[PDB]
Symmetry: C4
Subunit: 331 residues, 4 copies
């Protein structure tokens, strides 16, 4: 084997990230303004804009969830707070009209009680929220939830980075599979644990397991430009989950921070020391971006342009677009 040893499976794949590829233009009759940006968040729930906000305590509380839903997407309420408080945020969102909202749960002992309280509060989507879903306890939580509240609530499972992991969540009954182990902007898992999977390759692999079963893939983490959203969907994802890109907005939790005459907001990993109080995230800053509505408009504008270039009238068509792989020189 050219890279060493005698086992060709030891190095299993060549992993591409977003910066490794570009979308190829294709024959087009599609005007960006007329493209249909709607897409499946789960088997049953279709969003007008294929974007959801991360379940992080510097990204999504009630204010963000409301703004995301109004913009045509959805928020996923973080779970780094008491059950009663998270449930009250669900109620707060549902009081602001017929707005979709999701909420994160874990797989701990209090996870089941948290999920039932969220159901009682009227939540539409429960996100079983882990860093590694390929695990009996996670698969069991997904299955138990689906069998118990599945008629009324859609159950998302994640995160995965391999085909087999995605397959396991599908068999467990997930209504959507969330992809991303290691790609987050504030992630240190790759240097702390040495574990990860570049996100374009991870999406391609997850989609190979989910699409034949009609299960939507959520691309979670590593998106830094509006162009990355188009790439994620073209790789086969149905929606993208965003942390860093939304953390700088007025609707995100937290105050403005002034450093060197410039405005920022804090953005921290849920695995950072601060969030937990062996960290796998950092605490950082992102530039202040203004209102969420305007950020979403710019992000969707980029996606619409990609749909024009690729001749994709719908997200389903964009999922069939082709890539070109680029070199380092294509900085």
């Amino acid at each position: 084997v050219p890279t060493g040893g005698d086992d060709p499976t030891k190095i299993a794949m060549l992993g591409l990230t977003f910066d490794d590829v570009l979308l190829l233009p294709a024959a087009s009759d599609v005007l960006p303004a007329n493209a249909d940006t709607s897409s499946q968040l789960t088997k049953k729930i279709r969003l007008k804009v294929p974007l959801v906000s991360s379940a992080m305590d510097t990204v999504t509380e009630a204010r963000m969830a409301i703004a995301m839903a109004r913009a045509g997407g959805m928020g996923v309420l973080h779970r780094n707070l008491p059950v009663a408080e998270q449930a009250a945020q669900v109620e707060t969102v549902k009081r602001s009209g017929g707005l979709l909202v999701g909420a994160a749960v874990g797989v701990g002992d209090d996870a089941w009680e948290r999920a039932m309280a969220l159901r009682d509060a009227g939540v539409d989507v429960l996100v079983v929220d882990t860093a590694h879903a390929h695990n009996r306890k996670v698969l069991d939580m997904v299955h138990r939830l689906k069998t118990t509240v599945g008629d009324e609530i859609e159950v998302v499972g994640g995160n995965v980075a391999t085909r087999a992991a995605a397959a396991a969540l599908v068999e467990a009954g997930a209504d959507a599979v969330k992809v991303g182990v290691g790609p987050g902007s504030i992630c240190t898992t790759r240097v702390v644990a040495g574990v990860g999977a570049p996100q374009i390759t991870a999406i391609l692999e997850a989609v190979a397991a989910c699409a034949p079963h009609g299960v939507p893939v959520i691309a979670d983490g590593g998106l830094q430009y509006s162009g990355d959203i188009a790439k994620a969907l073209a790789a086969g994802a149905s929606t993208a989950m965003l942390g860093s890109l939304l953390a700088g907005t007025a609707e995100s939790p937290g105050e403005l921070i002034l450093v060197n005459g410039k405005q920022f907001k804090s953005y921290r990993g849920m695995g950072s020391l601060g969030a937990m109080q062996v960290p796998e995230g950092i605490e950082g800053r992102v530039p202040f971006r203004g209102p969420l509505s305007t950020v979403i408009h710019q992000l969707v504008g980029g996606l619409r342009a990609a749909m024009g270039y690729t001749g994709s009238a719908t997200i389903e068509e964009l999922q069939q677009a082709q890539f070109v792989q680029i070199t380092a020189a294509g900085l």
Copy 2:
């Protein structure tokens, strides 16, 4: 598939840009001073120097077009101004002697009226000027123009980045095909839309569709050194269109700008916020370079050297030169 999924066509190609390749020397009897630099701009029009200036409002108005033609190349007048004004610039160039000149038109409603006014003003080349020519409206404009004014005016279509797109323009009747989706120095399409195609690969693909029909390819965008002009022609292009390399010249529109004791001129994308008033270009600065005549001399000097090294007595011979692909270490 090593990069993910089960579909080998999902990632269609490995895209090389100019920095990825070098020209290999070959047996030579050619002195740089004696090389013939003439090349086809279109099926009928041959230039003494294979260079045209970009149709941008910080690069080509009448003064630039006149200087380019005198230097043996051609200018393409930008269209970010009223029809009457653009037509008056055509007249101004034709009044300065028997000088070749081209002018950009769009595919909007006013595009046809613009084209006829340019024809009346005496224009030699009409450039159907879009970011994505693989589109019924663009192909129809090219065809209508060719059938209507084709005997007197050469019609250029662009831009394309794929073989099929170039083929479609050829069938539509284009007299030259312009290549470049995403490579421009001031371009943000790659980060906004996630769309693009590295330019050496794009030229190779376009040429595979155009050369068998005797249609010249114009390499448009991403050229930053005189050496890139040689590479573009060796990949099979017949001419190169330059923006950044000519924007710093005395003949370009705009004033000198002094920052930190150094001289610059503004250079902005036609898709920048400033030009349009979702932007796909930026507004920037380029160093002031002095007279156009001298810049062209230096650029052509580099091309002549390449022709000496490769034993290319003509541009047609240079189009048959070979490359070596380099690694990152070859910075």
Copy 3:
């Protein structure tokens, strides 16, 4: 041959280093806190933590060796000092309880006398400590030691970077093979001699020769993050030897250095001019890190996380994990 010449064996392999790969997650029932981190240092000696400290005079003297053993690993006492002094450090470690300790010897004339003095002092592991073990004098020293004191003392040989070299040490009777020619943080062999072998590939190759004979591989050099320890073990190593990561600790030799308001300690190659008094190492600084116990806890924490992600209940299982190769864009 695509890279030149007619001999496909001239460029023998594509060498990967730690930054070239990530560990893929796999099905897991393993809790990080419950993972078994024990591993073979040699055929007979198993450590609770698979880490040993480098035999360098800015890393391991008696204080470090004691702390490493207490933390569940081991120290290898450097040999840049008189035989009597090194032997006294062995005694000092053994006086602090039933603590494992190793000590470096060379292959010079005084090497044999040094080894016997270390044996008399009660050493558990002798490390035949060279930059290139594939050499008759090194193989002879390993063999002589094994045959003479092998019943009481384990003999480590190194360093190697190729399969054949590792094979030769195995046949010579080594109880463990140490891998690393050129990867050290303070190493200049790669620029001075142009010699080296990227460490993931070197480990894969050494393991292919050692594992079928039941001989553990020690990955030595180039480890800069806790994640690199997981990668080294997953490539097939049984332990990792650390220099830079431990040189900043309270237990390492040397004083604190203050530069620009920040605390550092000196860290220098044993091939640096300072250590020898043609250098193949530099003298540098590393940040002060505090107590060794805490550094080891953080390093092992990272390893435990990797074992959770990969479903590895033991180091033997981690050695069967798979990689994904990443590109430059995966910075």
Copy 4:
């Protein structure tokens, strides 16, 4: 074709430079101090140290040539000066004992008269000194010289970067072939003309044409570390020509320059504007390095280390060593 077009020969090779490869250690009985560093400069002339100084006016005049010969290598006197003056420098070197010396000639009209004057002055090696030897005028000069003064003087031809070019010089009668089109530290040919060939690949290709005819290859340009000398010889070169590495020495032409409290010397391309008075070189600075004797000692020390690691008792053995290719991450 994956990179574009339908012609697999368009991109002819993947070109490696020195930074792309490392030498693999191999079984060794060779002590660095005992390695034989002698090598053929030409078919007849063997040097004790396989190094020659560049024919540049900031590197080699009489003082450098004398010092190089005394160190066991050779200097090649530059030709950017009157014939009488260059010839007087030859005389000056021969007056300092039985010291080998070479001198550069061109292929212009005055080239023949220059060569005869150098022969009369007692020169040992004539270097036909061009940037592209694959040319009838260069091949004719080599042949004419060999047939006219070949019994007394060795004739070097260069530069080449391809197998066919090297073959042509061999057939012309060259006693050594010099390799390097574009790799020089002060070279801008790659950005001006877009022409070049990475040096490890260029050496491998030239050697494939020269070695079967017993003609030594001189690796010229791009060497920045002592380790690059080992790599060049291992790729099959017999000697290396150095510019930048020797330009900082006391024996090089020019004065010391003080900038920001540090000592430098000027180093400029023979194709720089300053040397010619379309430039293909720059004028730069290199750090002051002290006496040549000491620089050579350090360079040879590195080579000796490489010979120890690779088990090469002679340069002929080193030419049979193997490489490993490294990635970008192996910075």
